[PDB]
Amino acid sequence: GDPIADMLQVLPTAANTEAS
Amino acid sequence: EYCPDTDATAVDKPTRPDVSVNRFFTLDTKSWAKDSKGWYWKFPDVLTEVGVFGQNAQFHYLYRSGFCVHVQCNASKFHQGALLVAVLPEYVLGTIAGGTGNENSHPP
Ligand SMILES: [Cl-]
Ligand SMILES: [K+]
């Protein structure tokens, strides 16, 4: 059929800190 | 109480040494005389050089705690007198301003 084949960064608040 | 997570701001894990610092420390005894004016102590200043509490207070920038304050005074059933023992938060001291009130001196 075809003759030619080749043809938000900042959220509302500051990040929380999680316990280690 | 220990500081809750909702109120904390510093992010490092705190050290809570417990029994080595939450215990009773007895300071130098005062002598009550018929003409005594009264005394004061500042917290936590009183213990910054005493025991493991003192060491932690000096090794860390941040400190926090409550206190159980116990004042003792014995006398006989024939003695009389009354001491008012009170806790004044943020006890800022002032001077007599040179007596005349003209000198803006400060407590040392
Ligand atoms: Cl003064
Ligand atoms: K957040």
Write phi, then psi, for B67 (nearest 5 degrees).
Answer: -155, 145
- CA pair distance B41, A6, nearest whole angstrom: 89
Asked if residues B97 and B104 have their Cβ atoms less than 8 Å apart, the reply is: yes
C-alpha angle with apex B43: B41 to B49, nearest 5 degrees?
90
- CA pair distance B108, B93, nearest whole angstrom: 10
Instruction: Tell me whether residue B31 is exposed, middle or buried, using C-beta atoms within 10 angstroms of its C-beta: 0 to 12, 13 to 18, 19 or more.
Output: exposed
Residue B6, CB-side half-sphere exposure with 13 Å CA sphere: 0
> How many other β-carbons are positioned within 10 Å of the β-carbon of residue B85?
8
> Chains A, B: CB contacts under 8 A, how many?
3
Elucidated via = X-ray
The two tokens of residue B97 are 């301003």
DSSP B56: H
The resolution of the experimental structure, rounded to one decimal in Å, is 2.5
> How many other β-carbons are positioned within 10 Å of the β-carbon of residue B56?
17
The two tokens of residue B46 are 């009183």
Rounded to the nearest angstrom, the distance between the alpha carbon of A4 and the centre of ligand 2 is 56
Reduced DSSP (H G I as helix, E B as strand, rest coil) percent helix, strand, coil of chain A, to 5: 0, 0, 100
* Count helices and strands in chain B by DSSP H and E runs: 1, 0
> How many other β-carbons are positioned within 10 Å of the β-carbon of residue B57?
19
CB contact under 8 A, B11 and A17: yes
DSSP B52: H
Q: Which residues in chain A have their CB less than 8 angstroms from residue B11's CB?
A: 17
Nearest chain B Cα to A19, which residue? B13
Asked if residues B65 and B87 have their Cβ atoms less than 8 Å apart, the reply is: no
